[PDB]
């Protein structure tokens, strides 16, 4: 397998604007929506029909319960920290927690809390202790640390549990995740020529693109299209260089192509 | 969704008790010991979620993940230990299962 | 700061109501309700991870709660049967992800025909 991994995002807003929910928390596996709740719904619902279909009804309803604590916590915690910092008005409060399931076998796990966009605590899994950005941090970190059960809790659950849901989420969407498709790619050349190599239809997401002169000689001077989402769950990229023999060389889940341009 | 241990233990005072819990359940977020006297509530004495044992003055849990087996040592007996011990797991779903209880007599 | 129920006894005709209470000032998120009978432990028959939530546990079937508020939670047995005779124990612990339980005194309720 690629590597793959598992995330949960949690967001809180304080006074939000009407229709906004005060509550949302998203699950993710790789690039793929698996899961949502809101404050609106408060009801877990999958945002895959592989994770609709091997998930039987008791999975959702536990987990909205879980939820509704979750989304309760969050708006006791945001409300206490804008205290701690004497602030009014509408504040975000945010939780990433994940782990990541290497092609080597090896895994890595984590866990952090952003404060109005800003890195506010991080987990540290191998030491059980939390990295607090300032004194309000601080003053939560200390809180957390004198609850050890927690942070060893915390640490079973990214370095085991979080593992065991990625695996079992992985097979459910075997067809989707798993699959490859190759990269279409092509060269066009648009008083200053540049040639572009673009790159289209393909997934996973991830790929390398760049051009080399006179066969082993990565150029300077590249430009980079952003890896897009192209909407039917294929991506798109390119690089370009100002205008020697050049080509362009994409690496794909494996695979190296070289197109030279003549 | 299972959860084993035995119904009774007797053993003399002044000697040692292991109280062995096996469990299967989907998904594990931590076992737990607790202590009932006769006619009283249960009152919490451990939690492991790591292997390995941990230890809180005569008393010792222990955990095995890959095993799924954990067992409760009661060292230096004392009367006063004679009393209902209850393994619960915390699964994956976040549901706490109890086992049965084993009631530990301690023999004067 | 604590947890208490109460009846902590009672002996009811069997087909009528009967709303066992059970509050706590910890400030705990998580509620639950067991009963105890002999060689099958505890079991859940409901359980609240927040105040305005409830679920069901293992043997909800008889029994009915609500949570409006955070502070108690209430068992009721719309129509007692023999067979809801038994040790009630009430809970609750910080959270369902969080803390070790810690229970009520514990309820006796002995239904007969």
């Known amino acids: 397998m690629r590597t793959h991994s598992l995330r949960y995002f949690r967001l809180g807003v304080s006074d939000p604007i009407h229709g906004v929910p005060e509550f949302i928390s998203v699950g993710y596996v790789d690039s793929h929506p698996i899961t949502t709740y809101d404050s609106v719904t408060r009801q877990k619902e999958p945002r895959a029909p592989w994770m609709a279909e091997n998930l039987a009804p008791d999975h959702w309803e536990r987990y909205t319960q879980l939820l509704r604590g979750w989304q309760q916590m969050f708006k006791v915690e945001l409300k206490r920290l804008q205290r701690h910092y004497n602030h009014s008005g509408s504040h975000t409060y945010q939780r990433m927690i994940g782990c990541e399931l290497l092609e080597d076998g090896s895994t890595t796990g984590f866990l952090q809390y952003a404060y109005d966009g800003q890195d506010f605590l991080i987990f540290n899994k191998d030491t059980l202790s939390w990295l607090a950005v300032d004194n309000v941090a601080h003053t939560i970190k200390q809180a957390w640390e004198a609850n050890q059960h927690e942070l060893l809790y915390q640490k079973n659950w990214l370095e085991e549990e979080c593992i065991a849901w990625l695996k079992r989420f992985l097979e459910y969407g075997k067809d989707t995740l798993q699959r490859t498709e190759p990269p279409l790619v092509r060269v066009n050349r648009k008083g200053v020529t540049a040639l572009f190599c673009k790159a289209h239809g393909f997934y996973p997401p991830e790929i390398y693109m760049t051009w080399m002169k006179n066969g082993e000689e990565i150029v300077q001077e590249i430009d980079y299209g952003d890896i897009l989402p192209s909407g039917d769950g294929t991506y798109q990229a390119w690089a370009s260089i100002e205008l020697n023999l050049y080509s362009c060389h994409v690496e794909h889940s494996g695979v190296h192509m070289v197109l030279q341009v003549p | 969704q299972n959860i084993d241990q035995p119904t009774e233990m007797t053993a003399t005072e002044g000697a040692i008790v292991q109280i062995n819990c096996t469990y299967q359940t989907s998904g594990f977020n931590g076992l737990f010991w607790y202590q009932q006297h006769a006619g009283e509530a249960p009152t919490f004495l451990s939690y492991?979620?790591?292997?390995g044992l941990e230890e809180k003055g005569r008393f010792s849990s222990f955990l095995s993940r890959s095993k799924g087996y954990s067992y409760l040592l009661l060292k230096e007996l004392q009367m006063k230990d004679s009393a209902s011990y209850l393994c619960?797991?915390?699964?994956?779903?976040?549901?706490?299962?109890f086992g049965a209880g084993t009631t530990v007599t301690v023999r004067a | 700061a604590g947890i208490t129920q109460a009846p902590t006894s009672q002996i009811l005709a069997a087909g009528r109501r009967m709303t066992l209470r059970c509050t706590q000032d910890?400030?705990?998120?998580?509620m639950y309700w067991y009963r105890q009978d002999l060689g099958l432990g505890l079991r859940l028959i409901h359980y609240?991870?927040?105040?305005?939530?409830?679920g069901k546990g293992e043997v909800p079937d008889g029994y009915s709660v609500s949570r409006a508020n955070t502070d108690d939670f209430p068992l009721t047995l719309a129509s007692a049967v023999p067979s809801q005779t038994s040790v009630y124990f009430c809970?609750?612990?910080?959270?369902?992800?969080?803390?070790?339980?810690?229970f009520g005194e514990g309820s006796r309720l002995t239904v007969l025909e």
């Open positions: 910890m400030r705990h998120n998580a």
């Open positions: 492991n979620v790591l292997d």
């Open positions: 809970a609750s612990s910080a959270g369902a992800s969080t803390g070790e339980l810690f």
């Open positions: 609240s991870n927040t105040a305005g939530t409830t």
């Open positions: 619960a797991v915390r699964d994956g779903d976040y549901k706490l299962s």
